Nucleic acid binder design. Structure first.
Ligand SMILES: [Mg+2]
Ligand SMILES: [Mg+2]
Ligand SMILES: [Zn+2]
Lengths: 39, 52, 263, 14, 221, 83, 1111, 94, 104
DNA sequence: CATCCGTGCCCTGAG
RNA sequence: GGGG
DNA sequence: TATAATGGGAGCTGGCACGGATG
């Protein structure tokens, strides 16, 4: 979010979970969100 | 700017013997064009009494 | 076991489960003292075990015990703890909070990126104790009690209290949120600009991060109370300070729609 | 699994 | 069944009645045992239903009264072709019954309702969630009581220590009990008339300071 | 060993987190048998406890930082020099 | 003004009674207007006939009757009563041993009555019973998913009327039957029915390898009695196999008409599928002491023939509308009536044993409490019984035509996949493919088609015109889907010269499949395009130009339109706006021909041809379920000659008989300084000036005074510690006066409650001593105006104890109701929408001088951003705007029917006729072309919109034919650098308004157990900070704000009290403490025999209860 | 955006340390009534009232500006807590 | 002291009894006329604590000058009513019963 | 290979 | 059930 | 307090699926 080294104390796992989940409703010849969950 | 109708308590009332509700009567009174000849005159109270 | 508004009584299902348990326990004691045969005592002990199971985790084994004239299973301790309505997810990992409001949002093109339009009455209620303190500092009220009794009636509200509320919210920020909160930018910090009317004014550039439009969307407002919470909001959560996506690193608050069209 | 059926079976043994 | 007790509970209370019947049976009367047993079994079952079927336990005679009221109201509704009034039920009940008594009896007979009663067709809300807590003081009430105590101390500081202490001891702000005039006089060593005089002059000073500053008026509600 | 996110979240050392996730009865029974102690390492634990989470301003790395003006700083320095 | 209608399609039949699906259903269910001896064995009659005779003394049923309502509909709505009729039943108790007969008419309670419009009044609230779609009973054959070459036979009765039976061919070869989750060989049950190996071998032997799997020697060796005992041992293990018990159980499972009831539709479907005839609605019979098969052998034969691949046998599409049927109001009410009747029968049978076996009357035997309880339950707490949506008349008209797959006896939300929610090809003409909710309930809730009607069997039928040779007759046939699949049905727009098909090739459907077909192959034809869509969807003009996903929103949002005080019909109509006002009995019409004798604001008196003088009272300023005002205005004058069916009074949201859900406004399609950014809408202050989009809303307030153990609650003007300024608008009794203005904080009804006993704190003792004023016995419990509400008091209703005609619930002395109304002007945050799915919130109200305006000085009313059109693909609003410009300058309105309306050339012609008035008027007034108009024409021919070289008038006319005009910016006076689309558009004000939804809370009520703030604006609750909001705060790293959310701002009692005190004292907020919900969790875990211990770093226990819970 | 937010983020190894420093300095200023400020009378943050310019009541803005000046010293283990509190109360009493 | 850990473990019958302030011997809730809690019932004030702050049931001791006192007449301790959210009771079973969590 | 259990978006809402 |  | 009376009664949550354990 800042294009600079991350600060010590940044809750990184929550950010990872949100960044992976937010486009979930957009996932549609394609396997899609079922494939993402299977993985 | 104001209206008082006898035997009428609020705008949502309705007058016996009158076809228009008070809302429509006030809507019609909003179309009234009143010209003051005296420039020192800032308020007037018109009176109306009709029947039959 | 509480008396509601109309004098009626409302009680928890745990009370009925405990009553079942105690009735069966006392009946077992009386049957033992009176030397009942083994069939009766066995039936009573099995019913006592069933009642204990009903109290701890109803519906776990056998048919769930219901109140008379109802198919609704009684709510046991296990049902209270677990589930989407359970204690953890409903009252521990998330709560209903004070100093919060909600209203329909409106595009505020005149706002700066760090700003949001806040209705006057919403701000009067949200900052009410700060406003009481400011009304006591200025000569608007003798003390806090009189200031609150004055704010209680809307017709007793004069225009100096609005200037006092302007003085209260100076420099401070509020938190705007829109459900669903898919990523951390579903909540953002904005400096509030007091506005007439009952609508919240949202900056256009953040509408992409909230996934917000103006076909009827509503947002919630929260007031960080401490100096620590206010500093966290102004430094880390401010809308103008989070311009890039934490997911991709690309710009999130970027031109769109009408801006792109005109340029 | 049915307490009443079990109790009736136990009653039927006397 | 269907009276508020489960089938197995009724079975067990009937077994209690059967034990009583076994203990009271006299075979010399040539009556078969089922005859004498049935009476005690029905007695125990009805007693249990009357004693346990209600969360708010009601004595057995009052339960009989309420059931008689229900039967009378049902007779009146079957004969009148509509639900009866309080006065009609009072009439059908005979002497000693007026509409007020029928109403009070029906009010006493009301059973409580579950806090977990669902609201809406989704499993997302409960009834008790819409029920406020009227017991614990709100933050506003606690703040108001604290401000009242502080303004009271501010107003009592405008007295002397002795005449403020007299009021504090007489009205219970200290130790929680309201001392009699004799006790405050014996604590300050003075006469009860003397302590009454200084109490009255302290109250006079407080009333004057109040009429001057108008501070403690807003706490009069 | 590779396990999915559900099993990995259920198998964490913190029993408060696992019990607030899913399978509350199973997790709670096994943790109560084991006499498990939750060290409040993660976020969900302190959130349930209403504590200050160990991230951001609550991280032990930045939590104990002090601020002092040079006037008071030098006054304290002179007071500690004269002891 | 002139009304021009387009379209060449001639509909041979009008729309059916739109509320007939409710009216006819309930009328057939009750049969109240049929004399008892001539009733049919249906509905309540069928229920009585099924429950009786009660065998055990024998109690038999003769007839029933319905009385007149004890109170009218208005009085029921006023007094929280149910509009109902008394039900009586004539029963004769017979002693078959003595011959004694005692006959009496017993009262069975009251049954709610359906009003004229198709709704009910339950406990004072209007309610609607929504029809329920479900699988039709019968015998179906589905492919076995596990084994491809095999199938499953499903015998399905009516819901709650018996179990589902599954016939399967197991891998081992034997045929199994599945009932109540238990499986057994079907051969045993066949042996109980009396079948022998000879009969089965000769009947099923044509299908080779399966009959040998049917053969079991041990079952054929034993007679049907041993087989019956064996089957009973299989079905009821542990139960001693007494032969009579086995007979009774198997009879009640298969042959009992009281316990097993196939549908009449189920019986017909079985007879049609298997090619047999049923003597009853059971799977077998108990005749002459033995069991006789009815259904099992034909189903087994069909299954074996389908497995073998015998031609003429097919699998069943379970979503086909021939296999899915509707249960309307009558059927659901009858089901619950039947359940209550069975419970009353159990009570009767129990009474026929106790007491005196000699002296008994039908009145002593019958207790009607179970039946009353069942009916009251169905009408009050069922899911299918819903709070009536009467926002506008169309709201309730659509609500009554709703179809739910949910409800008791139907799908749960997880039980619904893609197959159910799908649009089946048989939905054509029956279920609207457009009108369905957006979100989780999509496909589950649907609406009935316009021309559709549900037959007596429960299947939706659609009309088609017969085509013989090439001639289209005027006779119409209402078909089910199963019958529809037989013919080739041509489209309704196929060209015709007279009654003959004028096309060499026509577009037709065969089993829903589209095909090109010669006029000789045409067997039927569609009645109209209108039959494919619902009522709401048929009100969308230019529907053929709108994407389905947005036409859905248009249909669903016409429901949410608020009745406006100056509401008007759209300039572009579809032809249904009159019929909708007609069938939704909001408007008033004349019965016969006659003359109007009297016209008042309260009533209309008409003298008809019969000479009789009929007075119609007008509903004036009545509050609907949703707060919208329902009022009727007279549309006739004294002495006016009216005919049969002529309009007398306009209902809510109707203009001269036409549906008026909104207003026609002059709209310009252009961006505007980002104020219409992302679907937002900019409006003109002139809309508020002439009271457009202004609506009347009434809110009802209620308060009770009751008897307490501490003393009576009294509704009084004497309230402790209140000034005369606070008690100004209250009368002597304490009720606010009619006509007073009330604002937040004002008192509506004053009330005093006796103070709960309490020792005054020593501080209160000293305060009392200082001021010398006794603490009053009573406390102020007055009903006040909630935050954000208020208005004018229009009505007050007071009901005491001891006054004639009124009796309250036990303990309540008196009840007072205050009715407060308010005129709501359109403001920032209110929601607007058109019929094409375009919806937006008002974000800016500009003064008239800033508005873009025409050259002649006419400012536009609404500014819509064009960015909401391309992605949404709803072009119907564009054509509506063009035709509305044409009709704005020609002074006329239009009727563009669905899929057969005005096309582009006709609109161009009307636009030329309008441009003549728009420009030749100017040219005759002595004005030429404007300079800015010339610059705009330059930039327009640069855009290729006009042809270069033509005169300025010709180019302006070309632009006008393209629906675009020169628009001046009122801020600069300079024009917009391009021609802009401007025209009249019909826009509605929706029920979502900022005045209802604005809310905020500092501190307030908390919950009992959790001590967390309550929820909702009505309870002054706080906003929920759910798990995902906590995730957001965590990802930000805002630890102290999160801790505030978890503590100081919620359920940290010490923390929140100290925080409030520190804030009102100007101090910084204190350190938070332990949340009370965590202590609740600890104690609830201790109640589960689990020891939860908070420890320090030394593993020593830490007491978060602070010594309060430890001895 | 907050004035000089980039330079404020440049002062620290962690943004959250900047937040902690700002919050603690604001708490100091609130507790001691702003009279412990490192700002000069012309560097004091101002607020426009109906009367005119007054001191900015928001201590967080004060703290951020003070940090921008550079006259504040931040770090870990700079002074025992009780000693710091008592010396601040000696230099700037309540 | 500051909480650093949270331990969960099985509870002996002895620990359950050490939690309990008394045994609930009756299925009664509150009296049908007085609406006050029934003695030895599920809401008894002698077990779980006083309904009102620093006030016994019968009303002999009504202020904080008595705290920790147990009224001899009604048997209720005079403390804060908040303890009714904390203090546990217990039921003594005639026959042991299995905790279903450790069974199913 | 069967069988039991436990999961299955968030905030609002309102008679 | 309604809304995003 | 005594005629004799001697094994219930709902009719489930039945158009979802998927997977992690234990038989
Ligand atoms: Mg949206
Ligand atoms: Mg009487
Ligand atoms: Zn006592």
């Amino acid at each position: 979010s800042m294009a600079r080294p991350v600060s010590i104390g940044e809750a990184v796992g929550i950010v990872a979970a949100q960044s992976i989940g937010e486009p979930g409703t957009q996932l549609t010849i394609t396997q899609g969100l079922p494939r993402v969950i299977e993985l | 700017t104001s209206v008082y109708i006898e035997d009428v308590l609020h705008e949502f009332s309705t007058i016996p013997g009158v076809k228009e509700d008070v809302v429509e009567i006030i809507l019609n009174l909003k179309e009234l064009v009143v010209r003051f000849l005296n420039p020192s005159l800032q308020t007037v109270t018109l009176l109306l009494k009709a029947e039959g | 076991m509480v008396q509601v508004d109309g004098g009626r009584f409302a009680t928890s299902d745990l009370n009925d489960l405990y009553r079942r348990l105690i009735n069966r326990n006392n009946r077992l004691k009386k049957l033992l003292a009176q030397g009942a045969p083994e069939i009766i005592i066995r039936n009573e002990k099995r019913m006592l075990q069933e009642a204990v199971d009903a109290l701890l985790d109803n519906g776990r084994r056998g048919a769930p015990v219901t109140n008379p004239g109802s198919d609704r299973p009684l709510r046991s301790l296990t049902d209270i703890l677990s589930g989407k309505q359970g204690r953890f997810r409903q009252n521990l990992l998330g709560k209903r909070v004070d100093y919060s409001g909600r209203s329909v949002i409106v595009v505020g093109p005149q706002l700066k990126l760090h700003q949001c339009g806040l209705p006057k009455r919403m701000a009067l209620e949200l900052f009410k104790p700060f406003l009481l303190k400011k009304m006591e500092e200025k000569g608007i009220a003798p003390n806090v009690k009189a200031a609150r009794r004055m704010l209680e009636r809307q017709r007793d509200i004069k225009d100096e209290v609005w200037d006092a509320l302007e003085e209260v919210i100076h420099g401070k920020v509020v938190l705007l949120n829109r459900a669903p909160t898919l990523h951390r930018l579903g909540i953002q910090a904005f400096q509030p600009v007091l506005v007439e009317g009952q609508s919240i004014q949202l900056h256009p550039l953040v509408c992409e991060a909230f996934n917000a439009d103006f076909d009827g969307d509503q947002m919630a407002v929260h007031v960080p109370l401490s100096s620590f919470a206010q500093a966290e909001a102004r430094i880390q959560m401010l809308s103008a300070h989070n311009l890039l996506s934490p997911a991709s690193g690309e710009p999130l608050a970027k031109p769109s729609r009408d801006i792109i069209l005109g340029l | 699994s049915d307490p009443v059926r079990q109790y009736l079976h136990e009653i039927g043994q006397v | 069944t269907g009276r508020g007790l489960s089938f197995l509970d009724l079975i067990q209370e009937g077994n209690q009645g059967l034990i009583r019947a076994v203990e009271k049976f006299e075979y010399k009367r040539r009556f078969k045992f089922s005859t004498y047993a049935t009476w005690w079994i029905r007695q125990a079952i009805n007693r249990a239903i009357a004693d346990q079927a209600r969360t708010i336990r009601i004595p057995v005679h009052m339960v009989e009264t309420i059931n008689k009221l229900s039967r009378t109201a049902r007779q009146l509704q079957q004969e009148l072709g509509r639900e009866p009034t309080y006065e009609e039920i009072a009439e059908a009940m005979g002497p000693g019954w007026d509409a007020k008594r029928v109403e009070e009896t029906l009010k006493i007979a009301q059973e409580p309702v579950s806090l977990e009663t669902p609201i809406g067709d989704e499993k997302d809300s409960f009834y008790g969630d819409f029920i406020p807590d009227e017991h614990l003081p709100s933050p506003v009430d606690a703040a108001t009581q604290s401000l009242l105590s502080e303004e009271l101390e501010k107003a009592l500081s405008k007295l002397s220590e002795r005449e403020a202490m007299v009021l504090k001891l007489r009205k219970g702000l200290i130790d929680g009990r309201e001392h009699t005039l004799e006790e405050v006089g014996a604590f300050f060593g003075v006469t009860r008339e003397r302590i009454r005089q200084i109490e009255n002059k302290a109250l006079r000073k407080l009333k004057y300071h109040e009429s001057r500053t108008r501070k403690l008026r807003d706490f009069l509600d | 060993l590779l396990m999915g996110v559900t099993k990995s979240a259920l198998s964490t050392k913190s029993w408060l987190s696992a019990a607030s996730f899913q399978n509350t009865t199973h997790v709670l029974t096994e943790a109560a048998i084991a006499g498990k102690k939750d060290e409040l390492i993660g976020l969900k634990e302190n959130v349930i406890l209403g504590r200050l989470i160990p991230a951001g301003t609550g991280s032990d790395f930045v939590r104990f930082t002090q601020v002092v003006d040079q006037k008071t700083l030098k006054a304290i320095e002179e007071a500690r020099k004269e002891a | 003004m002139e009304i021009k209608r387009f379209g060449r399609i001639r509909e041979v039949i009008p729309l059916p009674p739109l509320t007939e699906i409710q009216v006819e259903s309930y009328r057939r269910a009750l049969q109240a207007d049929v004399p008892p001896e001539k009733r049919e064995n249906v509905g309540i009659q069928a229920a009585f006939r099924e429950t009786f005779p009660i065998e055990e003394l024998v109690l038999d049923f003769l007839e029933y009757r319905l009385g007149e309502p004890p109170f009218p509909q208005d009085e029921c709505r006023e007094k929280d009563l149910t509009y109902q009729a008394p039900l009586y039943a004539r029963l004769q108790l017979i002693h078959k041993d003595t011959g004694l007969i005692k006959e009496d008419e017993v009262f069975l309670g009251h049954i709610p009555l359906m009003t004229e419009d198709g709704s009910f009044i339950i406990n004072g609230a209007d309610r609607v019973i929504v029809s329920q779609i479900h699988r039709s009973p019968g015998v179906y054959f589905t492919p076995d998913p596990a084994r491809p070459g095999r199938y499953i036979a499903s015998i399905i009765p009516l819901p709650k009327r018996g179990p589902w039976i599954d016939l399967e061919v197991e891998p081992n070869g034997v045929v199994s039957m599945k009932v109540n989750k238990r499986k057994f060989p079907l051969v045993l049950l066949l042996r109980v029915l009396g079948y022998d190996q000879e009969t089965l071998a000769r009947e099923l032997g044509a299908y080779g390898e399966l009959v040998q799997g049917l053969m079991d020697e041990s079952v054929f060796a034993m007679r049907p009695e041993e087989a019956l005992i064996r089957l009973f041992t299989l079905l009821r293990p542990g139960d001693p196999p007494k032969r009579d018990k086995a007979v009774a159980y198997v009879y009640g499972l298969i042959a009992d008409p009281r316990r097993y009831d196939l549908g009449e539709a189920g019986r017909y479907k079985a007879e049609e599928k298997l090619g047999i005839r049923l003597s009853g609605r059971t799977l077998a019979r108990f005749e002459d002491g033995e069991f006789k098969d009815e259904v099992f052998l034909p189903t087994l034969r069909y299954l074996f023939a389908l497995t073998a691949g015998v031609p003429g046998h097919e699998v069943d599409d379970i979503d086909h509308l021939g296999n899915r049927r509707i249960r309307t109001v009558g059927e659901l009410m009858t089901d619950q009536f039947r359940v209550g009747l069975a419970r009353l029968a159990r009570g009767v049978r129990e009474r026929m044993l106790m007491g005196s076996e000699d002296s008994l009357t039908p009145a002593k035997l019958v207790n009607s409490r179970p039946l009353e309880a069942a009916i009251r339950e169905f009408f009050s707490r069922s899911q299918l019984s819903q709070f009536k949506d009467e926002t506008n008349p169309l709201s309730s008209l659509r609500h009554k035509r709703r179809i739910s797959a949910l409800g008791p006896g139907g799908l749960t939300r997880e039980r619904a996949g893609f197959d159910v929610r799908d649009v089946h090809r048989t939905h054509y003409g029956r279920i609207c493919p457009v009108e369905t909710p957006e979100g989780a309930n999509i496909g589950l809730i649907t609406s009935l088609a316009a021309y559709a009607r549900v037959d007596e069997l429960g299947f939706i039928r659609t009309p088609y015109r017969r085509v013989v040779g090439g001639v289209v007759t005027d006779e119409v046939v209402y078909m089910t889907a199963t019958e529809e699949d037989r013919y080739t049905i041509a489209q309704a727009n196929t060209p015709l010269e007279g009654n003959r098909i004028a096309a060499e090739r026509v577009v037709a459907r065969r089993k829903g499949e589209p095909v090109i077909v010669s006029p000789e192959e045409v067997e039927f034809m569609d009645v109209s395009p209108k039959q494919v869509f619902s009522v709401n969807t048929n009100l969308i003009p230019f529907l053929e130009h709108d994407d389905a996903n947005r036409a859905l929103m248009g249909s669903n949002m016409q429901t949410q339109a608020v009745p406006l005080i100056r509401a008007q019909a759209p300039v572009v109509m579809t032809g249904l706006e009159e019929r909708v006002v007609r069938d939704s009995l909001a408007a008033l019409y004349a019965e016969e021909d006659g003359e109007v004798a009297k016209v008042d604001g309260n009533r209309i008196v008409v003298r008809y041809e019969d000479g009789r003088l009929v007075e119609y009272p007008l509903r004036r300023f009545y509050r609907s379920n949703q707060g919208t005002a329902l009022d009727q205005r007279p549309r006739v004058v004294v002495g006016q000659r009216v005919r049969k069916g002529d309009l007398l009074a306009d209902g809510p949201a109707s203009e001269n008989g036409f549906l008026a859900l909104g207003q026609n406004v002059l709209v310009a399609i252009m961006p505007f300084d980002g104020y219409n950014f992302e679907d937002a809408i900019v409006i003109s202050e002139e809309l508020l000036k002439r009271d457009f989009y202004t609506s009347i809303h009434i809110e009802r307030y209620e308060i009770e005074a009751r008897d307490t153990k501490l003393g009576p609650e009294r509704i009084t003007r004497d309230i402790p510690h209140l000034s005369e300024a606070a008690l100004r608008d209250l009368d002597e009794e304490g009720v606010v006066r009619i006509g007073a203005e009330v604002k937040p904080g004002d008192i509506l009804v004053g009330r005093t409650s006796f103070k709960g006993e309490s020792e005054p704190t020593p501080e209160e003792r000293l305060l009392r001593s200082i001021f010398g004023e006794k603490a009053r016995d009573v406390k102020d419990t007055s009903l006040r105006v909630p935050p954000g509400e208020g208005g004018i008091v229009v009505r007050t209703v007071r009901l005491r104890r001891g006054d004639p005609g009124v009796e309250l619930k036990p303990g309540v002395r008196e009840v007072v109701r205050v009715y407060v109304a308010q005129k709501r002007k359109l403001q920032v945050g209110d929601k607007l929408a058109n019929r094409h799915g375009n919806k937006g919130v008002v974000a800016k109200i500009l003064p008239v001088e800033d508005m873009p305006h025409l050259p002649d000085g006419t400012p536009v009313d609404v500014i819509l951003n064009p960015l909401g059109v391309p992605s949404r693909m709803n072009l119907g609003q564009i054509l509506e705007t063009h035709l509305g410009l044409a009709g704005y300058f020609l002074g006329q309105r239009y009727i563009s029917p669905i899929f057969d309306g005005a096309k582009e050339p006709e609109i161009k012609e009307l636009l030329a006729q309008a441009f003549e008035v728009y420009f030749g008027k100017r040219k005759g007034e002595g004005f030429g072309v404007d300079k800015r108009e010339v610059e705009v024409l330059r930039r327009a021919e640069k855009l290729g919109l006009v042809t270069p070289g033509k005169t300025p008038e010709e180019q302006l006319k070309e632009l006008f034919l393209q629906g675009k005009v020169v628009l001046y910016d009122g801020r600069t006076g300079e024009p917009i650098e391009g021609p802009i689309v401007v025209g009249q558009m019909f826009i509605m004000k929706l029920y979502h308004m900022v005045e209802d939804k604005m809310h905020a809370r500092s501190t307030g009520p908390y919950s009992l157990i959790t001590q967390q703030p309550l929820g909702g604006k009505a309870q002054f609750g706080g906003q929920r900070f759910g798990e995902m909001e906590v995730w957001a705060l965590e990802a930000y790293g805002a630890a102290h704000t999160l801790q505030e959310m978890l503590t100081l701002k919620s359920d940290d009692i010490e923390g929140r009290n100290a925080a409030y005190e520190a804030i009102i004292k100007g101090e910084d907020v204190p350190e938070p403490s332990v949340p009370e919900s965590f202590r609740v969790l600890v104690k609830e875990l201790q109640a589960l025999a689990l020891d939860v211990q908070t420890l320090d770093e030394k593993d020593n226990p830490v007491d978060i209860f602070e010594g309060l819970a430890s001895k | 955006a907050e004035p000089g937010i980039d330079k404020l983020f440049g002062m620290v190894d962690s943004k959250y340390r900047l937040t902690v420093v700002v919050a603690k300095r604001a708490q100091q200023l609130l507790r001691h009534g702003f009279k412990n400020t490192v700002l000069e009378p012309e560097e004091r943050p101002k607020m426009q009232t109906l009367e005119g310019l007054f001191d900015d009541p928001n201590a967080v803005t004060w703290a951020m500006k003070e940090l921008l000046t550079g006259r504040l010293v931040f770090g870990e283990n700079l002074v025992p807590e009780d000693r710091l509190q008592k010396e601040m109360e000696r230099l700037y009493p309540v | 002291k500051e909480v650093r850990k949270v331990r969960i473990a099985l509870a002996s019958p002895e620990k359950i009894r050490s939690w309990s302030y008394g045994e609930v011997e009756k299925p009664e809730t509150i009296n049908y006329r007085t609406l006050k809690p029934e003695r030895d019932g599920l809401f008894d004030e002698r077990i779980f604590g006083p309904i009102k702050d620093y006030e016994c049931a019968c009303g002999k001791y009504k202020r904080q000058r008595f705290e920790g006192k147990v009224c001899e007449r009604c048997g209720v301790e005079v403390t804060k009513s908040i303890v009714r959210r904390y203090r546990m009771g217990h039921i003594e079973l005639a026959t042991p019963a299995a905790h279903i969590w450790f069974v199913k």
